[PDB]
Amino acid sequence: TVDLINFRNFGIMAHIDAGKTTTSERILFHSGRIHKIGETHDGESVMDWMEQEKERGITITSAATSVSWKNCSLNLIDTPGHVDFTVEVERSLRVLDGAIAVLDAQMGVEPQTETVWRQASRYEVPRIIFVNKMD
Amino acid sequence: RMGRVHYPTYRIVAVDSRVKRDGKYIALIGHLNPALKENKCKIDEAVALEWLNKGAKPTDTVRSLFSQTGLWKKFVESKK
Amino acid sequence: NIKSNEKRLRQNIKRNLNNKGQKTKLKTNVKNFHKEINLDNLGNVYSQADRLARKGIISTNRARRLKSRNVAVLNKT
Amino acid sequence: MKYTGSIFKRSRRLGFSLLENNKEFSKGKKRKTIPGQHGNRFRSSTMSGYAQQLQEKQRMQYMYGITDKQFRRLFRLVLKQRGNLAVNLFRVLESRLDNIVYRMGFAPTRRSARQLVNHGHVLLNDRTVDTPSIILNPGDKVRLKAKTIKIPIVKAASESGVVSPFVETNNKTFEGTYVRFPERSELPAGINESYVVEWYKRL
Amino acid sequence: KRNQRKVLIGIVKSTKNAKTATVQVESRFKHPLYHKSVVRHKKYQAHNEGEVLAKDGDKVQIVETRPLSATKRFRIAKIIERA
RNA sequence: UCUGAGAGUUUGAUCCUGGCUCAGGAUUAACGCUGGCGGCAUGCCUAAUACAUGCAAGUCGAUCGAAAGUAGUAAUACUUUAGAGGCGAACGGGUGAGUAACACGUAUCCAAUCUACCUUAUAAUGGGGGAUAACUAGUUGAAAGACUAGCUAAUACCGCAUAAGAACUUUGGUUCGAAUCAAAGUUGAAAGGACCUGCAAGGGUUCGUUAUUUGAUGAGGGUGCGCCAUAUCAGCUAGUUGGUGGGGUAACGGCCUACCAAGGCAAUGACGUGUAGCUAUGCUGAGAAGUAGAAUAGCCACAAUGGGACUGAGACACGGCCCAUACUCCUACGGGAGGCAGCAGUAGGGAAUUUUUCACAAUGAGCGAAAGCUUGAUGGAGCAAUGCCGCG
RNA sequence: UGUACCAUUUUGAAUAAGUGACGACUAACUAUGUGCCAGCAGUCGCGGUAAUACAUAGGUCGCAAGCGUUAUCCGGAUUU
C-alpha cells in the first residue's frame, strides 16, 4: 500500500446551506476520477438549483469515502449534513488528520460555522478555509 | 472417517472416476479407523484382485492394506 | 464457477468446428456412395468410419450401423 | 426430584425405611403416613392399579437417589437383552454405581454417596468417574481414590461397611466387589418392581 | 431367442392389427386386509413375428422383449389353439 | 404367541345404541419459567423465489512454440502456462417444483446400446505435409469489447505406410429372434515429449496416443409382480392402430417418415384430472394396519422456465455455449450480462429451522512420474437444552 | 485442542430450580374472597343463603436443568 506518511483523512468540516455537500461531491469526483467506467462524463459538474438543501445534505452524505490522489490517500467523509449538532461533525473531526472548513462569501450570515470551527480547534488539527459561494 | 468427532470411523468403498465415499460403490472395501492401525475390512486377497482385474480401481488409501496382503506382488506380474 | 468449464468450452468449441468438418466429410462420402453405388465407395466409407471411430468422438456403433445401411443399398443394386 | 434435602420425609411417606432406624427414626418427630394438613383417607378414588404402580415406582427411584431419565435409559438398555423385565430391571437398578457404593457401606446417605462419587474419587474399570453413571456388573471392583481415603465422614462410613449375601467390601483398603445380583430373595421386602412392569401398556 | 422364462401368459382377445394381437391377462392377486383372492384384467400388445399369428379366443404365452411398435413392447411366443 | 388399562357420556333408577375425551412413545420443535457443564446429534415440513457476497474439481510441459524474468555474454539451470491440446468438467451438494413410472423391488430382453482413464492384452508408438494460436502489427474502442493482417511449434490440423485383430461384401457351417465357424471381397492406426547408458543404433526410462479386447464405471428402451387420488369424472383415443420400404439417437422400437391402413383403452369405471420424488430407511401398537420416502444410500427430477447444437464415453450440459421469456449493472443510451432446486446467508410464512463457517489435517475424484491443488464433498467447529444423554 | 483423561493441583457446603395440578377419569388439597358474579376446564363438568376443582397463602405429590403446554401416528374406542 501507500506509505504510512500518506494516510491522511479529511472530513467535511462545515454545515449545509453553505454549498457544503456540493463541494464535498466536487472533491469526491475530483480525487475519484476514473475513466474506464465512463464516470468522467457522469459526474462532470455539480451545482445547485437549490430550493431544498435536505436532499443535498442527505444524498451526498459520504459516511466514509476513501480514494487515492497521486501522493497520498484522501479519505473524504461528509458525515455532517445537519446545520448544528456534534456527532457527525465530531466523528469526522476525530477521523480526519486534516480539515477543510467550507465557508461562504455570498451568505456570510451562516450561523453554525463558529461551533464547527471550535470543535476542530480543540485538537489543533490542520485546517484549510475554503469558500465556494463566490459565484 | 465419519461418525462422532474424536471417535472417527472410516468406511472404505470403491470408485471408478467420479463417485464419493460411502455413497455409490462397486463393493464396500470395509471399515478402518484413521486412529486404528489394523483393519477389519473385507480384504481377503480375492476382492482386491477382483477390483483390479475388473477395472475401476477403488479408493487409494487402503493400498497399504492391500500391499500387506501381497496384492501388488502378484498383480504387477499378472498384468505383465 | 469453475475455470475448467470454460477451458473445456474452448476445447469443445474447437472440437465443434473440427467435428462439423469431419462429420460433413463422412456424410458427403456416404452421399457419394449412395449416388454411385459401388464397392470402392463402400471401402472409402469404411475407411472414413474407421477413422472417426478411432478418433473417439462418437462410438463405433454409429459408424457400423451407417455403413451397414449403405452396404444394404449396395446389395439392393 | 432426583434428589432430596430432607430424606426423612421421603422415607416416612413412602412407607419404606430408606434407613431402618436412621431415617424412620425418633429424632424429635417421627412419622409413617402422609404429613401436613392433608393427612387424610381420601374418599375420592385415589386408589387403583395406577396408584400403587406409581407409589412403588416412587419408593424404588427415591431409595436409589437416581433420576428417572436414567431409569428409562436402564429400561431401554435392558430391552436390548431378552429376558424378564421385572427381575432384570430391579437387579440393574440395584447395580447403580451410587447404590452399590452405598451398599458397600461407604456413605451414610444416598445423597452423600452420589455427591462423593460425582466429586471424582471413585475408580471403576480403571476410570475415576466424574459422573456416577456407570452401571456395575457382578465382580465390578469399585475403588476409593487416594483423596477419599482421608475424608473423615466417608472414613467413618467405610469402617462401618455393610456386607450382604450378594456383595462384599474390604473396608480397610476402601474397596468393594459386587459379588452377585440380588436375584429374588435379597431384595427389600416392602418393595415390588412388578408394578413398574405393569405400569406400561405399550410393551 | 435366448430369452428366459417370465410370466406373461394370457387369453388373446383380438388381432385387428396387422400381425399384432391384443391379449387379455387375468391375474389373481390378494386383498391386503380382508385376505381374499381377487382377479384383475390387463391388456398386452403381442407382436406377431409374421411366421406365427396369434389365433384369437385362446390362451397365448407372451415373453418380454424390446419394443416392436408404438405401445407394442411384446412379441407373441406360444399359442394354444381351439379344440 | 413378543404382546393388550380404564373411567367418565341419557331415564327417578336400569340397561342398550352410538359417539367424544384424557390415560402412550415421539419433535426440523416451539413454547412459559428459569437454567450445569460437556458429549452427542438435530437443525425451513412452508418459499422449486430472485439469488447479492466468497464458495460448489482442479490439475497439467514427462505434449508443444513462445510469453516471462531470477544468475548467466547468450545458450541456458530455473517458475508455470496466457494459448493450442488432456482428463475430470455429468464430480460434488442441493432441494422434490414437478415426476405415480420399470424410476423403483426382482430376473432379465437386450437378438440393439456405448462407456474416456481403468480393465483380459493381442497390436502399436513408420513417415510426414502444412497451418494455428503464443508472438507481431493495424483497427474500432471510456471500458465492455472488437475486426483485419501475417509467422511458427507440438501430443496441434490433415492423408498415407504396417495394421494381428478388426469393421464390412459373396459362399458354406452352425444355432432358439439370433447366438456360433470355414472360404473369400473391400478397407483403413497416429505422434511422439522427456531421463540415464550407449558414437549412433540399441538397451533401460517416464509420459501421450493407437487398435484389439475381459469387464467395471454411468446409463439407454422394454420388462411379469406391486407402485396416490380421481363416477358429485363414461366414454376417451386420428401415428389412434399396426404393416412393407427408407431414414434414425447408443440402439430394437411408427423412434420418425413415404406408402398401406381403422383401429387401440375401457363398467374389475376407460380417458381426463391434479398430486406424492420410488425402495431401504421414520414411529405407534401384539396385530391388523396407519403414519414420510422430506434430506439421505441407490435410482430419479429440475437444476431461472423452454428449446437448439457441440464436446465428452456418457450433457443437448446448475455453476459450458447460443437463444426466447423474468431480471439486471454501469453509460456518452452506442453497448455488453448471469444464476445457491451447491454450500451458507439473505427476503418472507411460520414457532423456528444452523456459519453471510475453518483445513483439505484424514477420506473422493480429477489430473500431474512427482512436489501436489481445490472442493461450501469430507472431516471439524459454531449454532439453538436444538433433542438425547449424565452429572450436581 | 492447553480438547479429551489424570492427579481434594487449592478454599469451601459451597456453583445452579422450575412446572402441572391435589374431586374422579389420572398421583398430587386444607383454609381464605367469591352467590353460577369472580374465574376453572381434555370428559364428567366446577361457583346462584358459609368454597379442599375457581383466585390466593400455603402443604402436597409427579418429576427436573429441565420442568408443563400444545403439535404429530397408532393402541388403549372390536366404539367400522
PDB file of N, CA and C (backbone and C1' of nucleotides) in Angstrom, chain F residues 348-372:
ATOM      1  P     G F 348     -38.250 -10.724   6.323  1.00  0.00           P
ATOM      2  O5'   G F 348     -39.644 -11.496   6.302  1.00  0.00           O
ATOM      3  C5'   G F 348     -40.778 -10.936   5.658  1.00  0.00           C
ATOM      4  C4'   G F 348     -41.381 -11.904   4.670  1.00  0.00           C
ATOM      5  C3'   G F 348     -42.131 -13.086   5.267  1.00  0.00           C
ATOM      6  O3'   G F 348     -43.474 -12.760   5.591  1.00  0.00           O
ATOM      7  C1'   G F 348     -40.677 -13.828   3.535  1.00  0.00           C
ATOM      8  P     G F 349     -43.977 -12.751   7.118  1.00  0.00           P
ATOM      9  O5'   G F 349     -44.799 -14.109   7.265  1.00  0.00           O
ATOM     10  C5'   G F 349     -45.960 -14.364   6.485  1.00  0.00           C
ATOM     11  C4'   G F 349     -46.231 -15.846   6.404  1.00  0.00           C
ATOM     12  C3'   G F 349     -46.091 -16.592   7.724  1.00  0.00           C
ATOM     13  O3'   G F 349     -47.293 -16.599   8.472  1.00  0.00           O
ATOM     14  C1'   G F 349     -44.779 -17.664   6.079  1.00  0.00           C
ATOM     15  P     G F 350     -47.324 -16.034   9.975  1.00  0.00           P
ATOM     16  O5'   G F 350     -46.814 -17.258  10.857  1.00  0.00           O
ATOM     17  C5'   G F 350     -47.413 -18.540  10.746  1.00  0.00           C
ATOM     18  C4'   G F 350     -46.389 -19.634  10.909  1.00  0.00           C
ATOM     19  C3'   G F 350     -45.533 -19.552  12.163  1.00  0.00           C
ATOM     20  O3'   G F 350     -46.167 -20.107  13.301  1.00  0.00           O
ATOM     21  C1'   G F 350     -44.133 -19.847  10.296  1.00  0.00           C
ATOM     22  P     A F 351     -46.408 -19.211  14.613  1.00  0.00           P
ATOM     23  O5'   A F 351     -45.026 -18.450  14.835  1.00  0.00           O
ATOM     24  C5'   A F 351     -44.531 -18.196  16.145  1.00  0.00           C
ATOM     25  C4'   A F 351     -43.351 -19.082  16.457  1.00  0.00           C
ATOM     26  C3'   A F 351     -42.374 -19.282  15.308  1.00  0.00           C
ATOM     27  O3'   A F 351     -41.371 -18.281  15.328  1.00  0.00           O
ATOM     28  C1'   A F 351     -42.919 -21.381  16.327  1.00  0.00           C
ATOM     29  P     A F 352     -40.787 -17.667  13.968  1.00  0.00           P
ATOM     30  O5'   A F 352     -39.381 -18.394  13.793  1.00  0.00           O
ATOM     31  C5'   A F 352     -38.486 -18.550  14.888  1.00  0.00           C
ATOM     32  C4'   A F 352     -37.650 -19.793  14.722  1.00  0.00           C
ATOM     33  C3'   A F 352     -37.154 -20.036  13.301  1.00  0.00           C
ATOM     34  O3'   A F 352     -35.912 -19.399  13.056  1.00  0.00           O
ATOM     35  C1'   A F 352     -38.263 -21.972  14.084  1.00  0.00           C
ATOM     36  P     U F 353     -35.437 -19.075  11.556  1.00  0.00           P
ATOM     37  O5'   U F 353     -34.718 -20.415  11.084  1.00  0.00           O
ATOM     38  C5'   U F 353     -33.731 -21.044  11.889  1.00  0.00           C
ATOM     39  C4'   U F 353     -33.608 -22.510  11.548  1.00  0.00           C
ATOM     40  C3'   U F 353     -33.531 -22.832  10.059  1.00  0.00           C
ATOM     41  O3'   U F 353     -32.193 -22.837   9.584  1.00  0.00           O
ATOM     42  C1'   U F 353     -35.080 -24.288  11.178  1.00  0.00           C
ATOM     43  P     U F 354     -31.463 -21.503   9.059  1.00  0.00           P
ATOM     44  O5'   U F 354     -30.182 -21.381  10.002  1.00  0.00           O
ATOM     45  C5'   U F 354     -30.324 -21.207  11.409  1.00  0.00           C
ATOM     46  C4'   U F 354     -29.123 -21.695  12.183  1.00  0.00           C
ATOM     47  C3'   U F 354     -27.767 -21.222  11.663  1.00  0.00           C
ATOM     48  O3'   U F 354     -26.899 -20.960  12.765  1.00  0.00           O
ATOM     49  C1'   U F 354     -27.812 -23.582  11.722  1.00  0.00           C
ATOM     50  P     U F 355     -26.127 -19.554  12.856  1.00  0.00           P
ATOM     51  O5'   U F 355     -24.963 -19.696  11.779  1.00  0.00           O
ATOM     52  C5'   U F 355     -24.438 -18.558  11.106  1.00  0.00           C
ATOM     53  C4'   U F 355     -22.953 -18.697  10.877  1.00  0.00           C
ATOM     54  C3'   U F 355     -22.437 -18.137   9.550  1.00  0.00           C
ATOM     55  O3'   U F 355     -21.097 -17.672   9.726  1.00  0.00           O
ATOM     56  C1'   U F 355     -21.937 -20.425   9.675  1.00  0.00           C
ATOM     57  P     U F 356     -20.789 -16.232  10.377  1.00  0.00           P
ATOM     58  O5'   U F 356     -21.646 -15.214   9.502  1.00  0.00           O
ATOM     59  C5'   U F 356     -21.176 -14.767   8.239  1.00  0.00           C
ATOM     60  C4'   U F 356     -22.068 -15.255   7.128  1.00  0.00           C
ATOM     61  C3'   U F 356     -21.377 -15.900   5.940  1.00  0.00           C
ATOM     62  O3'   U F 356     -20.987 -17.239   6.185  1.00  0.00           O
ATOM     63  C1'   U F 356     -23.053 -14.413   5.180  1.00  0.00           C
ATOM     64  P     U F 357     -20.171 -18.055   5.068  1.00  0.00           P
ATOM     65  O5'   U F 357     -19.131 -18.911   5.919  1.00  0.00           O
ATOM     66  C5'   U F 357     -18.342 -18.281   6.916  1.00  0.00           C
ATOM     67  C4'   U F 357     -17.730 -19.272   7.874  1.00  0.00           C
ATOM     68  C3'   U F 357     -16.699 -20.225   7.300  1.00  0.00           C
ATOM     69  O3'   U F 357     -15.426 -19.631   7.106  1.00  0.00           O
ATOM     70  C1'   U F 357     -18.175 -21.414   8.709  1.00  0.00           C
ATOM     71  P     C F 358     -14.529 -20.057   5.842  1.00  0.00           P
ATOM     72  O5'   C F 358     -13.284 -20.823   6.475  1.00  0.00           O
ATOM     73  C5'   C F 358     -12.457 -20.214   7.457  1.00  0.00           C
ATOM     74  C4'   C F 358     -11.687 -21.253   8.232  1.00  0.00           C
ATOM     75  C3'   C F 358     -10.937 -22.277   7.390  1.00  0.00           C
ATOM     76  O3'   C F 358      -9.671 -21.815   6.946  1.00  0.00           O
ATOM     77  C1'   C F 358     -12.213 -23.406   9.016  1.00  0.00           C
ATOM     78  P     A F 359      -9.165 -22.151   5.456  1.00  0.00           P
ATOM     79  O5'   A F 359      -8.482 -23.584   5.588  1.00  0.00           O
ATOM     80  C5'   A F 359      -7.200 -23.736   6.183  1.00  0.00           C
ATOM     81  C4'   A F 359      -6.867 -25.190   6.400  1.00  0.00           C
ATOM     82  C3'   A F 359      -6.950 -26.078   5.166  1.00  0.00           C
ATOM     83  O3'   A F 359      -5.778 -26.037   4.372  1.00  0.00           O
ATOM     84  C1'   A F 359      -8.160 -27.080   6.915  1.00  0.00           C
ATOM     85  P     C F 360      -5.888 -25.875   2.777  1.00  0.00           P
ATOM     86  O5'   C F 360      -6.358 -27.312   2.271  1.00  0.00           O
ATOM     87  C5'   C F 360      -5.413 -28.349   2.027  1.00  0.00           C
ATOM     88  C4'   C F 360      -5.787 -29.628   2.735  1.00  0.00           C
ATOM     89  C3'   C F 360      -6.001 -30.835   1.830  1.00  0.00           C
ATOM     90  O3'   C F 360      -5.613 -32.017   2.528  1.00  0.00           O
ATOM     91  C1'   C F 360      -8.017 -30.334   2.973  1.00  0.00           C
ATOM     92  P     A F 361      -4.074 -32.480   2.532  1.00  0.00           P
ATOM     93  O5'   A F 361      -3.726 -32.668   4.077  1.00  0.00           O
ATOM     94  C5'   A F 361      -4.238 -31.782   5.064  1.00  0.00           C
ATOM     95  C4'   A F 361      -3.971 -32.291   6.459  1.00  0.00           C
ATOM     96  C3'   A F 361      -4.552 -33.660   6.789  1.00  0.00           C
ATOM     97  O3'   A F 361      -3.733 -34.730   6.343  1.00  0.00           O
ATOM     98  C1'   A F 361      -5.105 -32.145   8.514  1.00  0.00           C
ATOM     99  P     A F 362      -4.120 -35.566   5.023  1.00  0.00           P
ATOM    100  O5'   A F 362      -4.032 -37.089   5.481  1.00  0.00           O
ATOM    101  C5'   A F 362      -4.211 -37.458   6.838  1.00  0.00           C
ATOM    102  C4'   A F 362      -5.439 -38.313   7.022  1.00  0.00           C
ATOM    103  C3'   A F 362      -6.227 -38.631   5.759  1.00  0.00           C
ATOM    104  O3'   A F 362      -5.689 -39.717   5.031  1.00  0.00           O
ATOM    105  C1'   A F 362      -7.707 -37.877   7.426  1.00  0.00           C
ATOM    106  P     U F 363      -5.930 -39.820   3.447  1.00  0.00           P
ATOM    107  O5'   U F 363      -7.506 -39.973   3.296  1.00  0.00           O
ATOM    108  C5'   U F 363      -8.166 -41.169   3.679  1.00  0.00           C
ATOM    109  C4'   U F 363      -9.616 -41.133   3.281  1.00  0.00           C
ATOM    110  C3'   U F 363      -9.895 -40.719   1.846  1.00  0.00           C
ATOM    111  O3'   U F 363      -9.724 -41.766   0.909  1.00  0.00           O
ATOM    112  C1'   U F 363     -11.299 -39.503   3.282  1.00  0.00           C
ATOM    113  P     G F 364      -9.439 -41.407  -0.630  1.00  0.00           P
ATOM    114  O5'   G F 364     -10.794 -40.731  -1.116  1.00  0.00           O
ATOM    115  C5'   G F 364     -11.979 -41.495  -1.282  1.00  0.00           C
ATOM    116  C4'   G F 364     -12.778 -40.964  -2.439  1.00  0.00           C
ATOM    117  C3'   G F 364     -11.932 -40.493  -3.610  1.00  0.00           C
ATOM    118  O3'   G F 364     -11.610 -41.549  -4.498  1.00  0.00           O
ATOM    119  C1'   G F 364     -13.430 -38.779  -3.001  1.00  0.00           C
ATOM    120  P     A F 365     -10.251 -41.509  -5.354  1.00  0.00           P
ATOM    121  O5'   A F 365     -10.698 -40.842  -6.726  1.00  0.00           O
ATOM    122  C5'   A F 365     -11.966 -41.134  -7.295  1.00  0.00           C
ATOM    123  C4'   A F 365     -12.476 -39.971  -8.103  1.00  0.00           C
ATOM    124  C3'   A F 365     -11.438 -39.334  -9.007  1.00  0.00           C
ATOM    125  O3'   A F 365     -11.350 -40.007 -10.248  1.00  0.00           O
ATOM    126  C1'   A F 365     -12.487 -37.652  -7.726  1.00  0.00           C
ATOM    127  P     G F 366      -9.924 -40.310 -10.917  1.00  0.00           P
ATOM    128  O5'   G F 366      -9.973 -39.449 -12.250  1.00  0.00           O
ATOM    129  C5'   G F 366     -11.012 -38.506 -12.457  1.00  0.00           C
ATOM    130  C4'   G F 366     -10.467 -37.114 -12.617  1.00  0.00           C
ATOM    131  C3'   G F 366      -8.970 -37.009 -12.801  1.00  0.00           C
ATOM    132  O3'   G F 366      -8.537 -37.388 -14.093  1.00  0.00           O
ATOM    133  C1'   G F 366      -9.667 -35.383 -11.259  1.00  0.00           C
ATOM    134  P     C F 367      -7.667 -38.727 -14.276  1.00  0.00           P
ATOM    135  O5'   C F 367      -6.288 -38.189 -14.850  1.00  0.00           O
ATOM    136  C5'   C F 367      -6.281 -37.110 -15.764  1.00  0.00           C
ATOM    137  C4'   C F 367      -5.516 -35.929 -15.227  1.00  0.00           C
ATOM    138  C3'   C F 367      -4.080 -36.179 -14.826  1.00  0.00           C
ATOM    139  O3'   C F 367      -3.187 -36.399 -15.896  1.00  0.00           O
ATOM    140  C1'   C F 367      -5.089 -34.891 -13.166  1.00  0.00           C
ATOM    141  P     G F 368      -2.159 -37.627 -15.779  1.00  0.00           P
ATOM    142  O5'   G F 368      -0.743 -36.915 -15.641  1.00  0.00           O
ATOM    143  C5'   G F 368      -0.567 -35.579 -16.086  1.00  0.00           C
ATOM    144  C4'   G F 368       0.233 -34.759 -15.105  1.00  0.00           C
ATOM    145  C3'   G F 368       1.475 -35.409 -14.528  1.00  0.00           C
ATOM    146  O3'   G F 368       2.569 -35.452 -15.427  1.00  0.00           O
ATOM    147  C1'   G F 368       0.288 -34.349 -12.800  1.00  0.00           C
ATOM    148  P     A F 369       2.990 -36.850 -16.098  1.00  0.00           P
ATOM    149  O5'   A F 369       4.290 -37.307 -15.294  1.00  0.00           O
ATOM    150  C5'   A F 369       4.346 -37.221 -13.873  1.00  0.00           C
ATOM    151  C4'   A F 369       4.331 -38.581 -13.219  1.00  0.00           C
ATOM    152  C3'   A F 369       4.583 -38.564 -11.713  1.00  0.00           C
ATOM    153  O3'   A F 369       3.888 -39.648 -11.096  1.00  0.00           O
ATOM    154  C1'   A F 369       6.284 -39.800 -12.774  1.00  0.00           C
ATOM    155  P     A F 370       2.677 -39.356 -10.083  1.00  0.00           P
ATOM    156  O5'   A F 370       3.294 -38.339  -9.021  1.00  0.00           O
ATOM    157  C5'   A F 370       4.091 -38.806  -7.941  1.00  0.00           C
ATOM    158  C4'   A F 370       5.230 -37.863  -7.634  1.00  0.00           C
ATOM    159  C3'   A F 370       4.846 -36.495  -7.089  1.00  0.00           C
ATOM    160  O3'   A F 370       4.600 -36.510  -5.694  1.00  0.00           O
ATOM    161  C1'   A F 370       6.440 -36.241  -8.819  1.00  0.00           C
ATOM    162  P     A F 371       3.524 -35.507  -5.053  1.00  0.00           P
ATOM    163  O5'   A F 371       4.268 -34.883  -3.789  1.00  0.00           O
ATOM    164  C5'   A F 371       5.686 -34.844  -3.715  1.00  0.00           C
ATOM    165  C4'   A F 371       6.209 -33.429  -3.777  1.00  0.00           C
ATOM    166  C3'   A F 371       5.262 -32.340  -3.294  1.00  0.00           C
ATOM    167  O3'   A F 371       5.268 -32.194  -1.882  1.00  0.00           O
ATOM    168  C1'   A F 371       6.249 -31.695  -5.354  1.00  0.00           C
ATOM    169  P     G F 372       4.083 -32.807  -0.984  1.00  0.00           P
ATOM    170  O5'   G F 372       2.766 -32.550  -1.843  1.00  0.00           O
ATOM    171  C5'   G F 372       2.033 -31.340  -1.716  1.00  0.00           C
ATOM    172  C4'   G F 372       1.633 -30.802  -3.065  1.00  0.00           C
ATOM    173  C3'   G F 372       0.170 -30.412  -3.226  1.00  0.00           C
ATOM    174  O3'   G F 372      -0.105 -29.111  -2.733  1.00  0.00           O
ATOM    175  C1'   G F 372       0.872 -31.702  -5.088  1.00  0.00           C
TER     176        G F 372
END
